[PDB]
Design an enzyme around this catalytic site. Structure first.
Site, PDB file in Angstrom:
ATOM      1  N   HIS F 200      -1.840 -14.667  -8.045  1.00 35.09           N
ATOM      2  CA  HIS F 200      -1.983 -15.906  -7.300  1.00 35.09           C
ATOM      3  C   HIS F 200      -2.472 -17.014  -8.242  1.00 35.09           C
ATOM      4  N   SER F 204       4.617 -16.924  -8.781  1.00 33.71           N
ATOM      5  CA  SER F 204       5.599 -15.930  -9.187  1.00 33.71           C
ATOM      6  C   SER F 204       6.499 -16.457 -10.303  1.00 33.71           C
ATOM      7  N   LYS F 226      12.229 -12.612   5.003  1.00 38.16           N
ATOM      8  CA  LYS F 226      13.026 -11.922   4.006  1.00 38.16           C
ATOM      9  C   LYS F 226      12.349 -10.602   3.670  1.00 38.16           C
ATOM     10  N   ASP F 227      11.010 -10.589   3.713  1.00 33.28           N
ATOM     11  CA  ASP F 227      10.273  -9.364   3.456  1.00 33.28           C
ATOM     12  C   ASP F 227      10.503  -8.389   4.605  1.00 33.28           C
ATOM     13  N   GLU F 270       7.639  17.058  -9.143  1.00 34.16           N
ATOM     14  CA  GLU F 270       8.481  16.222  -8.289  1.00 34.16           C
ATOM     15  C   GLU F 270       9.420  15.358  -9.153  1.00 34.16           C
TER      16      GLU F 270
HETATM   17  C1  HEM Z   1       0.762   0.028  -5.622  1.00 32.40           C
HETATM   18  C2  HEM Z   1       1.575  -0.548  -6.500  1.00 32.40           C
HETATM   19  C3  HEM Z   1       1.848  -1.989  -6.549  1.00 32.40           C
HETATM   20  C4  HEM Z   1       1.742  -2.912  -5.587  1.00 32.40           C
HETATM   21  C5  HEM Z   1       1.295  -2.673  -4.189  1.00 32.40           C
HETATM   22  C6  HEM Z   1       2.151  -4.139  -6.144  1.00 32.40           C
HETATM   23  C7  HEM Z   1       2.166  -5.320  -5.415  1.00 32.40           C
HETATM   24  C8  HEM Z   1       2.763  -6.471  -5.843  1.00 32.40           C
HETATM   25  C9  HEM Z   1       3.079  -7.614  -5.061  1.00 32.40           C
HETATM   26  C10 HEM Z   1       2.839  -7.828  -3.598  1.00 32.40           C
HETATM   27  C11 HEM Z   1       3.640  -8.494  -5.916  1.00 32.40           C
HETATM   28  C12 HEM Z   1       4.188  -9.854  -5.631  1.00 32.40           C
HETATM   29  C13 HEM Z   1       5.608  -9.643  -5.067  1.00 32.40           C
HETATM   30  C14 HEM Z   1       6.659  -9.352  -6.127  1.00 32.40           C
HETATM   31  O1  HEM Z   1       6.799 -10.250  -7.017  1.00 32.40           O
HETATM   32  O2  HEM Z   1       7.356  -8.257  -6.097  1.00 32.40           O
HETATM   33  C15 HEM Z   1       3.663  -7.917  -7.193  1.00 32.40           C
HETATM   34  C16 HEM Z   1       4.129  -8.581  -8.304  1.00 32.40           C
HETATM   35  C17 HEM Z   1       4.038  -8.043  -9.572  1.00 32.40           C
HETATM   36  N1  HEM Z   1       3.666  -6.793  -9.889  1.00 32.40           N
HETATM   37 FE1  HEM Z   1       3.124  -5.459  -8.681  1.00 32.40          FE
HETATM   38  N2  HEM Z   1       2.482  -3.977  -7.398  1.00 32.40           N
HETATM   39  C18 HEM Z   1       2.337  -2.713  -7.728  1.00 32.40           C
HETATM   40  C19 HEM Z   1       2.580  -2.083  -8.943  1.00 32.40           C
HETATM   41  C20 HEM Z   1       2.904  -2.734 -10.108  1.00 32.40           C
HETATM   42  C21 HEM Z   1       3.175  -2.126 -11.339  1.00 32.40           C
HETATM   43  C22 HEM Z   1       3.173  -0.650 -11.623  1.00 32.40           C
HETATM   44  C23 HEM Z   1       3.456  -3.148 -12.231  1.00 32.40           C
HETATM   45  C24 HEM Z   1       3.796  -3.018 -13.678  1.00 32.40           C
HETATM   46  C25 HEM Z   1       3.707  -1.883 -14.365  1.00 32.40           C
HETATM   47  C26 HEM Z   1       3.355  -4.372 -11.486  1.00 32.40           C
HETATM   48  C27 HEM Z   1       3.541  -5.623 -12.016  1.00 32.40           C
HETATM   49  C28 HEM Z   1       3.795  -6.717 -11.217  1.00 32.40           C
HETATM   50  C29 HEM Z   1       4.258  -7.993 -11.786  1.00 32.40           C
HETATM   51  C30 HEM Z   1       4.508  -8.328 -13.234  1.00 32.40           C
HETATM   52  C31 HEM Z   1       4.418  -8.827 -10.755  1.00 32.40           C
HETATM   53  C32 HEM Z   1       4.874 -10.267 -10.825  1.00 32.40           C
HETATM   54  C33 HEM Z   1       6.373 -10.392 -10.590  1.00 32.40           C
HETATM   55  C34 HEM Z   1       6.868 -11.819 -10.622  1.00 32.40           C
HETATM   56  O3  HEM Z   1       6.262 -12.750 -10.030  1.00 32.40           O
HETATM   57  O4  HEM Z   1       7.927 -12.053 -11.243  1.00 32.40           O
HETATM   58  N3  HEM Z   1       3.016  -4.073 -10.204  1.00 32.40           N
HETATM   59  N4  HEM Z   1       3.117  -6.670  -7.131  1.00 32.40           N
HETATM   60  C1  HEM Z   2      -0.270   6.843  -2.493  1.00 31.40           C
HETATM   61  C2  HEM Z   2      -0.555   7.384  -1.304  1.00 31.40           C
HETATM   62  C3  HEM Z   2      -0.235   8.800  -1.049  1.00 31.40           C
HETATM   63  C4  HEM Z   2       0.742   9.534  -1.654  1.00 31.40           C
HETATM   64  C5  HEM Z   2       1.721   9.106  -2.729  1.00 31.40           C
HETATM   65  C6  HEM Z   2       0.636  10.821  -1.100  1.00 31.40           C
HETATM   66  C7  HEM Z   2       1.454  11.825  -1.573  1.00 31.40           C
HETATM   67  C8  HEM Z   2       1.420  13.065  -1.032  1.00 31.40           C
HETATM   68  C9  HEM Z   2       2.340  14.068  -1.357  1.00 31.40           C
HETATM   69  C10 HEM Z   2       3.461  14.024  -2.364  1.00 31.40           C
HETATM   70  C11 HEM Z   2       2.040  15.131  -0.588  1.00 31.40           C
HETATM   71  C12 HEM Z   2       2.790  16.436  -0.585  1.00 31.40           C
HETATM   72  C13 HEM Z   2       3.755  16.264   0.589  1.00 31.40           C
HETATM   73  C14 HEM Z   2       4.471  17.540   0.811  1.00 31.40           C
HETATM   74  O1  HEM Z   2       5.458  17.776   0.103  1.00 31.40           O
HETATM   75  O2  HEM Z   2       4.085  18.349   1.678  1.00 31.40           O
HETATM   76  C15 HEM Z   2       0.946  14.782   0.225  1.00 31.40           C
HETATM   77  C16 HEM Z   2       0.394  15.637   1.135  1.00 31.40           C
HETATM   78  C17 HEM Z   2      -0.688  15.282   1.905  1.00 31.40           C
HETATM   79  N1  HEM Z   2      -1.305  14.090   1.913  1.00 31.40           N
HETATM   80 FE1  HEM Z   2      -0.873  12.585   0.902  1.00 31.40          FE
HETATM   81  N2  HEM Z   2      -0.336  10.888  -0.183  1.00 31.40           N
HETATM   82  C18 HEM Z   2      -0.919   9.704  -0.092  1.00 31.40           C
HETATM   83  C19 HEM Z   2      -1.966   9.293   0.729  1.00 31.40           C
HETATM   84  C20 HEM Z   2      -2.661  10.151   1.566  1.00 31.40           C
HETATM   85  C21 HEM Z   2      -3.833   9.836   2.290  1.00 31.40           C
HETATM   86  C22 HEM Z   2      -4.567   8.496   2.297  1.00 31.40           C
HETATM   87  C23 HEM Z   2      -4.160  11.009   2.969  1.00 31.40           C
HETATM   88  C24 HEM Z   2      -5.298  11.310   3.870  1.00 31.40           C
HETATM   89  C25 HEM Z   2      -6.272  10.463   4.078  1.00 31.40           C
HETATM   90  C26 HEM Z   2      -3.185  11.983   2.637  1.00 31.40           C
HETATM   91  C27 HEM Z   2      -3.195  13.250   3.127  1.00 31.40           C
HETATM   92  C28 HEM Z   2      -2.289  14.214   2.782  1.00 31.40           C
HETATM   93  C29 HEM Z   2      -2.319  15.566   3.373  1.00 31.40           C
HETATM   94  C30 HEM Z   2      -3.243  16.167   4.389  1.00 31.40           C
HETATM   95  C31 HEM Z   2      -1.321  16.251   2.838  1.00 31.40           C
HETATM   96  C32 HEM Z   2      -1.015  17.710   3.171  1.00 31.40           C
HETATM   97  C33 HEM Z   2       0.069  17.823   4.238  1.00 31.40           C
HETATM   98  C34 HEM Z   2       1.470  17.751   3.634  1.00 31.40           C
HETATM   99  O3  HEM Z   2       1.777  18.451   2.653  1.00 31.40           O
HETATM  100  O4  HEM Z   2       2.364  16.994   4.103  1.00 31.40           O
HETATM  101  N3  HEM Z   2      -2.300  11.429   1.804  1.00 31.40           N
HETATM  102  N4  HEM Z   2       0.566  13.510  -0.073  1.00 31.40           N
HETATM  103  C1  LIG Z   3       1.558 -11.991  -1.245  1.00 26.96           C
HETATM  104  C2  LIG Z   3       2.991 -12.002  -1.664  1.00 26.96           C
HETATM  105  N1  LIG Z   3       3.329 -12.903  -2.623  1.00 26.96           N
HETATM  106  C3  LIG Z   3       4.617 -13.019  -3.080  1.00 26.96           C
HETATM  107  C4  LIG Z   3       5.636 -12.181  -2.564  1.00 26.96           C
HETATM  108  C5  LIG Z   3       7.054 -12.297  -3.065  1.00 26.96           C
HETATM  109  O1  LIG Z   3       7.117 -13.067  -4.273  1.00 26.96           O
HETATM  110  C6  LIG Z   3       6.388 -14.291  -4.154  1.00 26.96           C
HETATM  111  C7  LIG Z   3       4.888 -14.040  -4.147  1.00 26.96           C
HETATM  112  C8  LIG Z   3       5.311 -11.251  -1.581  1.00 26.96           C
HETATM  113  O2  LIG Z   3       6.213 -10.489  -1.153  1.00 26.96           O
HETATM  114  C9  LIG Z   3       3.973 -11.129  -1.130  1.00 26.96           C
HETATM  115  C10 LIG Z   3       3.686 -10.144  -0.048  1.00 26.96           C
HETATM  116  C11 LIG Z   3       2.933  -8.991  -0.260  1.00 26.96           C
HETATM  117  C12 LIG Z   3       2.688  -8.080   0.764  1.00 26.96           C
HETATM  118  C13 LIG Z   3       3.167  -8.317   2.044  1.00 26.96           C
HETATM  119  O3  LIG Z   3       2.938  -7.452   3.128  1.00 26.96           O
HETATM  120  C14 LIG Z   3       1.880  -6.541   3.099  1.00 26.96           C
HETATM  121  C15 LIG Z   3       0.577  -6.998   3.171  1.00 26.96           C
HETATM  122  C16 LIG Z   3      -0.479  -6.098   3.112  1.00 26.96           C
HETATM  123  C17 LIG Z   3      -0.232  -4.734   2.986  1.00 26.96           C
HETATM  124  O4  LIG Z   3      -1.308  -3.796   2.905  1.00 26.96           O
HETATM  125  C18 LIG Z   3      -2.153  -3.890   1.840  1.00 26.96           C
HETATM  126  F1  LIG Z   3      -2.861  -2.773   1.657  1.00 26.96           F
HETATM  127  F2  LIG Z   3      -1.541  -4.126   0.682  1.00 26.96           F
HETATM  128  F3  LIG Z   3      -3.005  -4.890   2.009  1.00 26.96           F
HETATM  129  C19 LIG Z   3       1.085  -4.284   2.958  1.00 26.96           C
HETATM  130  C20 LIG Z   3       2.141  -5.184   3.012  1.00 26.96           C
HETATM  131  C21 LIG Z   3       3.899  -9.463   2.282  1.00 26.96           C
HETATM  132  C22 LIG Z   3       4.137 -10.365   1.251  1.00 26.96           C
END
Ligand code: HEM
Ligand code: HEM
Ligand SMILES: CC1=NC2=C(COCC2)C(=O)[C@@H]1c1ccc(Oc2ccc(OC(F)(F)F)cc2)cc1
Ligand SMILES: CCCCCCCCCCCCCCCCCC(=O)OC[C@H](COP(=O)([O-])OCC(O)COP(=O)([O-])OC[C@@H](COC(=O)CCCCCCCCCCCCCCCCC)OC(=O)CCCCCCCCCCCCCCCCC)OC(=O)CCCCCCCCCCCCCCCCC
Ligand SMILES: CCCCCCCCCCCCCCCCCC(=O)OC[C@H](COP(=O)([O-])OCC(O)COP(=O)([O-])OC[C@@H](COC(=O)CCCCCCCCCCCCCCCCC)OC(=O)CCCCCCCCCCCCCCCCC)OC(=O)CCCCCCCCCCCCCCCCC
Ligand SMILES: CCCCCCCCCCCCCCCCCC(=O)OC[C@H](COP(=O)([O-])OCC(O)COP(=O)([O-])OC[C@@H](COC(=O)CCCCCCCCCCCCCCCCC)OC(=O)CCCCCCCCCCCCCCCCC)OC(=O)CCCCCCCCCCCCCCCCC
Ligand SMILES: CCCCC/C=C/C/C=C/CCCCCCCC(=O)O[C@H](COC(=O)CCCCCCCCCCCCCCC)COP(=O)(O)OCC[N+](C)(C)C
Ligand SMILES: CCCCCCCC/C=C/CCCCCCCC(=O)O[C@H](COC(=O)CCCCCCCCCCC)COP(=O)(O)OCCN
Ligand SMILES: CCCCCCCC/C=C/CCCCCCCC(=O)O[C@H](COC(=O)CCCCCCCCCCC)COP(=O)(O)OCCN
Ligand SMILES: CCCCCCCC/C=C\CCCCCCCC(=O)O[C@H](COC(=O)CCCCCCCCCCC)COP(=O)(O)OCCN
Ligand SMILES: CCCCCCCCCCCCO[C@@H]1O[C@H](CO)[C@@H](O[C@H]2O[C@H](CO)[C@@H](O)[C@H](O)[C@H]2O)[C@H](O)[C@H]1O
Lengths: 39, 120, 53, 32, 98, 378, 56, 74
Positions: F200, F204, F226-227, F270
């Site tokens: 922010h 972007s 659009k989102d 995986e």
């Molecule tokens: C939980 C994982 C992530 C979340 C929730 C997340 C969330 C977001 C959001 C909401 C935006 C703005 C919307 C967009 O431009 O697509 C954004 C932008 C961005 N994120 Fe992430 N992001 C994640 C992981 C990552 C990772 C792994 C990278 C790089 C390794 C990354 C780098 C960026 C960059 C560079 C931008 C700016 C893009 C632009 O304005 O051109 N993010 N992310």
């Molecule tokens: C990034 C967020 C998360 C990811 C990527 C994730 C990923 C996973 C994956 C890959 C499994 C194995 C699924 C399967 O093949 O059975 C799993 C299982 C599980 N996850 Fe998560 N998880 C997330 C968040 C959470 C959270 C917040 C909770 C609980 C608070 C949770 C509870 C569980 C439980 C109880 C299982 C066992 C049941 C099952 O195998 O489906 N997960 N999760």
């Molecule tokens: C802020 C924002 N800026 C830009 C773009 C696109 O590029 C311009 C900048 C976006 O697309 C967005 C955006 C990001 C998330 C979203 O919906 C949510 C909100 C909250 C949420 O849970 C959480 F845990 F993350 F809080 C999960 C989805 C809507 C819009």
């Protein structure tokens, strides 16, 4: 010229390197007498 | 100011919205009185009156007596203001013109969403 | 057949939902897509003019 | 002068209901 | 020749298809920021426009008619003089501080 | 005047998501950020529900999950969602990172490195989640992988045994992985908050790579609609899997309870870790393979310094575009290789793919940037 | 036009637009469920318990 | 930075139209199909080549694994 005529962080980073050495060695727990020298 | 355009637009649309939905009796009485005074005091001396005659015959095909104007104004109430304003303003599409440092002038879509109220 | 059901009791319910998901998405995807185009029409249509003195 | 700005032709993007430059668009406003 | 490749590359790059000039595409670091800041009203507003134009085209996933594309031969480095000097200045302050 | 602009809480939400000046021209590739947020919320909800029914004892765990799928009301759909959910999250993640690389979004350094950390953190999460059911793959997967930290000289053996909480992956490891897997998404949410906070500051990037201040538009309603459209498409996709093909992206050995006496014919993690498995497997030496695996991910952090082009985005960089897609295809290949047993010809395909990967990032695409520069007389 | 009739009747007032949507969702839920169900159970004639249960 | 001091722009006229005055899908296929073709011709020689090579390395190496698992007469 003026950076290199810095290098005044060399004796300060010497003392910070001993802090890093002695710090990792304290947190982790022979040839220091008394402390651990006598397990 | 270059930074007040949005705030201005918001308050203004809010006014149109308020009149469409919720105009009060009292403020309508006030609006009546303003227009009453406006009509009387405008038609003062020979030139304004000569024009009124001239344009009136072109636009209404006749001159409208002051006393007629007054009885049409007297007709208007809260309900009438609401009802009429809704006809023209409420959920209708405006035409918009800006010139200058208008970087902040609300996007057209935002302007159009401002022509109604979700609450009504 | 029994061994499939034993491994996945849900087989039938899931497939019913699949149908209802496909149907709802058939509705909702062009609908929302239409909403998108409407809002964006303001921008898609716009014409630009540079006019220095 | 600024008086020689004319607004471009929008015919291509218009709803068919609003094409006629000699008709009120208010007829079609409820529809649209 | 070298120039044969450069001309092919220019058309491949394709910024010309949006009616941009090369200098419009330079990534803006601090030096570039400043060079832009020193641009005269004519040259600045022109840039503002070319980019408005390109950005609006990018949105539409559209290009210009070929007639309207920026020609390899006609693309002047509007920015280089401003920028060469911004950089000369910086290099000077660097030198000095040692 | 206006509440959305004043109120301490509403102000933030307004500034963040309503009145935020967005570029006019961001593409579908900018959908992924929002979608990742959804992925994250999705996992937390489905996760929370599962966790109301699951147990993390070696003895009860496998059956508690199947109990969800047989006897808990709608437990099946929830479970398959959380599992396909995890796949959708990694798709969104890799798409998102893709856009970063191609469009030079990584110039936003703080945003970018936070992002790298988000990636690592989601990786840890999904690794430990996959163990939770206590299937054959879960168990033998978790064993092989954690064992790599044994190759750390001096401390390796001790370190892996401390993670485990014993002499193998056993009761204590599963119970702690449950704990970690629960709290990690929470930490991901905060890191993501911060991820946005830094974004922010700059607003972007866009596909041209050229500053877009002269053509911004309010986020709402252009990007709200659009989102949503994008989220529908994510849901379409997610549910296609869950309802038509719930097991498509998984391994069947994970229907066979974990058995410390019988090792599965091919051990794989995986799919979303296969490229890194294949890099690791290419190196003869075990610590070599570890450091390669780590570098295949951490290299993300270096890419900012490896940028040579005078243009930010690859839009106008033909040579760079070709190389970019080469890298993408190579990662498809690394994934294929990582799913394959260690035999000819795959051993050698993998070695090559591993070389190609690092070669592209560290030498070829830097070079291309520079060649392009010369082609443009700068 | 039909749409005109609808706009003035249902959609102009936002309170009304809402009342429309809740009521219509009600009839849509019932209608869509019933119809899709029949679509599935004709696609899967004979194979469902509810098709064979008369026998036991 | 918010709308109001993003940047400085002079002499640019933006004309546009309410969505309710206009079609959602102006000439959707008649303009859109050609445009999509144009878009694809533009990128395919950058994008497609790698995936061709993938398909080939995968074709070849899958069948090299096939062959090596068979016996040969010796
Ligand atoms: C939980 C994982 C992530 C979340 C929730 C997340 C969330 C977001 C959001 C909401 C935006 C703005 C919307 C967009 O431009 O697509 C954004 C932008 C961005 N994120 Fe992430 N992001 C994640 C992981 C990552 C990772 C792994 C990278 C790089 C390794 C990354 C780098 C960026 C960059 C560079 C931008 C700016 C893009 C632009 O304005 O051109 N993010 N992310
Ligand atoms: C990034 C967020 C998360 C990811 C990527 C994730 C990923 C996973 C994956 C890959 C499994 C194995 C699924 C399967 O093949 O059975 C799993 C299982 C599980 N996850 Fe998560 N998880 C997330 C968040 C959470 C959270 C917040 C909770 C609980 C608070 C949770 C509870 C569980 C439980 C109880 C299982 C066992 C049941 C099952 O195998 O489906 N997960 N999760
Ligand atoms: C802020 C924002 N800026 C830009 C773009 C696109 O590029 C311009 C900048 C976006 O697309 C967005 C955006 C990001 C998330 C979203 O919906 C949510 C909100 C909250 C949420 O849970 C959480 F845990 F993350 F809080 C999960 C989805 C809507 C819009
Ligand atoms: C991709 C993610 C997808 C998931 C999304 C899910 C969202 C919810 C789904 C349910 C939708 C059902 C719709 C019911 C709405 C009821 C309307 C109502 O009567 O409200 C009274 C109220 C005021 O009524 P009014 O008569 O029009 O008066 C106007 C005022 O004078 C003031 O005029 P104004 O010009 O300021 O008006 C502009 C208008 C337009 O401003 C908006 O609020 C638009 C922003 C929409 C954001 C949602 C889009 C989602 C797409 C992703 C992007 C994220 C956006 C923000 C998300 C917030 C959380 C992260 O804003 C307001 O109305 C002003 C009041 C300020 C409060 C609202 C802002 C808070 C942000 C979130 C709002 C609630 C949404 C649900 C959130 C829950 C889950 C996400 O209207 C609203 O709150 C709207
Ligand atoms: C392996 C996994 C994959 C990896 C990813 C997985 C990750 C998870 C998912 C995450 C998703 C991320 C993407 C985010 C995108 C968010 C939206 C966005 O930003 O913009 C949308 C983005 C571009 O938006 P735009 O405003 O078109 O931008 C145009 C550009 O300016 C350029 O302008 P232009 O004028 O050059 O454009 C030419 C135009 C024209 O070129 C074309 O290709 C024409 C062909 C159009 C197809 C039919 C049109 C449907 C409605 C139009 C009515 C007239 O083409 C387009 O507009 C391109 C967009 C896609 C074409 C539309 C969909 C084709 C499907 C064909 C189905 C045919 C049956 C339809 C009947 C529907 C009822 C069931 O388009 C897409 O990505 C497509 C999304 C919308 C599709 C909905 C249409 C309905 C399809 C049928 C539904 C059936 C449901 C199930 C079966 C039902 C059984 C009952
Ligand atoms: C020799 C025999 C053997 C064969 C092997 C050898 C191979 C030879 C052939 C070479 C093949 C590799 C090269 C790739 C294709 C060539 C280049 C190309 O794509 O040119 C496009 C090219 C790109 O345009 P551009 O302006 O240069 O740049 C694009 C912009 O950056 C942004 O554009 P925008 O902002 O206007 O947004 C629209 C955009 C949006 O783009 C994105 O956001 C990317 C991803 C999202 C897709 C679009 C949104 C729809 C949501 C999809 C997911 C929903 C559920 C459906 C089920 C998923 C299917 C598995 O949509 C597209 O561009 C569609 C391309 C998507 C390709 C995805 C690749 C498939 C993955 C396969 C992985 C391999 C393993 C297979 C295992 C199977 C699975 C378990 O332009 C066009 O074609 C016009 C774009 C508008 C779309 C036209 C109508 C299509 C309808 C779109 C919706 C459906 C897309 C299909 C998705 C999944 C299908 C499986
Ligand atoms: C009742 C108990 C529920 C508790 C939880 C709270 C939920 C909120 C609402 C629930 C009941 C459903 C009634 C919906 C209210 C009507 C919406 C509305 O009033 O506002 C619309 C927003 O919705 C749009 O976009 C919608 C398009 C995008 C899709 C989002 C729709 C949300 C669905 C509601 C979920 C129901 C929950 C069920 C849980 C058991 C505005 O759209 P327009 O700008 O074109 O209209 C312009 C205004 N005119 C037409 C009156 C001039
Ligand atoms: C805070 C409220 C959250 C609500 C989220 C709003 C969702 C917006 C998008 C919807 C996509 C449209 C397609 C949905 C198809 C629904 C069709 C349907 O009725 O299917 C449901 C199962 O579907 C399903 O279960 C399919 C649902 C797919 C939605 C998944 C996305 C959200 C993730 C939830 C994770 C916590 C049950 O059908 P039946 O068992 O026959 O029941 C008969 C009718 N009661
Ligand atoms: C530890 C992390 C490792 C590194 C990360 C690697 C990332 C993994 C890759 C996923 C795909 C990322 C997408 C990159 C950005 C897309 C760029 C793009 O759309 O380029 C198109 C061609 O599109 C097209 O041709 C679009 C087709 C999309 C192809 C599908 C990808 C295949 C998935 C492979 C999975 C392993 C040309 O677009 P522009 O230059 O913007 O020009 C637009 C028109 N003027
Ligand atoms: C040790 C094992 C090796 C196996 C590796 C397997 C994985 C990767 C394999 C192959 C990818 C090769 C890509 C080459 C295609 C480039 C040439 C081309 O077809 O298109 C060029 C693009 O120009 C340009 O881009 C100019 C040409 C420069 C291309 C550089 C080639 C380097 C690719 C990477 C090879 C690893 C012309 O197309 P456009 O400019 O789009 O205009 C089309 C109309 N003329
Ligand atoms: C081409 C020469 C003509 C005669 C051979 C014809 C067969 C086709 C060529 C490949 C020959 C196989 O011979 C070889 O076997 C080894 C052992 O699995 C594999 O090769 C691999 O060996 C070990 C595997 O642990 C690795 O350290 C090494 O880096 C790698 O090359 C390849 O499969 C192949 O290079």
């Amino acid at each position: 010229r003026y950076r290199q005529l810095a290098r005044n962080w060399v004796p300060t980073a010497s003392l910070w390197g001993a802090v890093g050495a002695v710090g990792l060695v304290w947190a982790t727990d022979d040839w220091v007498p008394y402390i651990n020298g006598k397990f | 100011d270059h930074m007040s355009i949005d705030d201005m637009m918001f308050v203004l649309q809010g006014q149109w919205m308020r009149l469409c939905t919720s105009a009060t009796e009292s403020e309508v009485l006030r609006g009546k009185n303003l227009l009453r005074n406006a009509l009387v005091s405008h038609l003062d001396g020979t030139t304004p009156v000569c024009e009124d005659i001239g344009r009136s015959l072109l636009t209404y095909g006749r001159r409208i007596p002051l006393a007629e104007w007054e009885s049409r104004i007297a007709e208007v109430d809260a309900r009438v203001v609401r009802e009429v304003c809704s006809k023209y303003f409420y959920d209708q599409c405006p035409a918009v013109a800006g010139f200058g440092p208008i970087e902040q002038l609300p996007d057209y879509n935002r302007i159009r969403s401002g022509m109604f109220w979700l609450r009504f | 057949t029994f061994l499939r059901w034993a491994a996945e009791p849900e087989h039938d319910h899931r497939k019913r939902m699949g149908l209802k998901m496909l149907l709802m998405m058939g509705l909702l995807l062009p609908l929302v897509y239409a909403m998108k185009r409407h809002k964006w029409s303001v921008l898609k249509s716009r014409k630009l003019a540079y006019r220095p003195p | 002068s600024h008086t020689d700005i004319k607004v471009p032709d929008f015919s291509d993007y218009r709803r068919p209901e609003v094409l006629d430059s000699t008709k009120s668009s208010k007829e079609s406003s409820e529809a649209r | 020749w070298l120039e044969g490749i450069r001309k092919w590359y220019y058309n491949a790059a394709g910024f010309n298809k949006l009616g941009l000039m090369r200098d419009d595409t330079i990534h803006e670091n601090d030096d570039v920021k400043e060079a832009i800041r020193r641009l005269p009203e004519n040259l600045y507003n022109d840039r503002v426009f070319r980019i408005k134009r390109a950005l609006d085209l990018s949105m539409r996933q559209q290009i210009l008619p070929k007639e309207q594309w920026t020609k390899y031969e006609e693309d002047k480095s509007y920015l280089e003089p401003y920028l060469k000097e911004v950089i000369r200045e910086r290099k000077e302050r660097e030198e000095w501080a040692k | 005047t206006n509440i959305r602009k004043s109120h301490p809480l509403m102000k933030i939400v307004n500034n963040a998501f309503i009145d935020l000046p967005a570029p006019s021209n961001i593409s579908s590739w900018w959908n992924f950020g929002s979608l990742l947020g959804i992925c994250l919320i999705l996992q937390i909800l489905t996760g929370l529900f599962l966790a109301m029914h699951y147990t993390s004892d070696t003895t009860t765990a496998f059956s508690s999950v199947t109990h969800i799928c047989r006897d808990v009301n709608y437990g099946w759909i929830i479970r398959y969602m959380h599992a396909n959910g995890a796949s959708m999250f990694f798709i969104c993640l890799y798409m998102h990172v893709g856009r970063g690389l191609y469009y030079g979004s990584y110039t936003f350094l703080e945003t970018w490195n936070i992002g790298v950390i988000l990636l690592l953190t989601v990786m840890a999460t999904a690794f430990m989640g996959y163990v939770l059911p206590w299937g054959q793959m879960s168990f033998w997967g978790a064993t092989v992988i954690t064992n790599l930290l044994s190759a750390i000289p001096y401390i390796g053996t001790n370190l892996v045994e401390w993670i485990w909480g014993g002499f193998s992956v056993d009761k204590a490891t599963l119970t702690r992985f449950f704990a970690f897997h629960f709290i990690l998404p929470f930490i991901i949410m905060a890191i993501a908050m911060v991820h946005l906070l830094f974004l922010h500051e700059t607003g972007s990037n866009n596909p041209t790579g050229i500053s877009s201040d002269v053509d911004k538009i309010p986020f709402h309603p252009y990007y709200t609609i659009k989102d949503i459209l994008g989220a529908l498409l994510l849901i379409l996709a997610l549910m296609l899997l869950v309802l038509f093909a719930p097991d498509l992206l998984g391994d069947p050995d994970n229907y066979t309870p974990a058995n410390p006496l019988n090792t599965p014919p091919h051990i794989k993690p995986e799919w979303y870790f296969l490229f890194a498995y294949a890099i690791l497997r290419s190196i003869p030496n075990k610590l070599g393979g570890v450091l390669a695996l780590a570098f295949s991910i951490l290299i993300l952090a270096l890419i900012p310094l490896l940028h040579t082009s005078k243009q930010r985005s690859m839009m106008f960089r033909p040579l760079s575009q070709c190389l970019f897609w080469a890298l993408v295809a190579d990662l498809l290949t690394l994934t294929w290789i990582g799913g394959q047993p260690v035999e000819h010809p795959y051993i050698t395909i993998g070695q090559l793919a591993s070389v190609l990967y690092f070669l592209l990032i560290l030498v070829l695409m830097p070079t291309a940037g520079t060649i392009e520069n010369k082609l443009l007389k700068w | 036009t039909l749409t005109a009739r609808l706009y003035s009747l249902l959609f102009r007032r936002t309170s009304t637009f809402a009342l429309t949507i809740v009521v219509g969702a009600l009839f849509f839920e019932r209608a869509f469920d019933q119809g899709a169900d029949a679509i599935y159970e004709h696609i899967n004639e004979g194979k469902l318990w509810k098709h064979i249960k008369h026998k036991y | 930075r918010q709308f109001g001091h993003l940047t400085r722009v002079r002499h640019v006229i933006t004309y546009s139209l309410s969505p309710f005055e206009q079609r959602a899908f102006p000439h959707y296929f008649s303009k859109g199909i050609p445009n999509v073709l144009r878009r694809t011709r533009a990128c395919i020689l950058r994008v497609a080549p790698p995936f061709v090579a993938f398909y080939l390395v995968y074709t070849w190496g899958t069948q090299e694994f096939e062959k090596s698992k068979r016996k040969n007469p010796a």
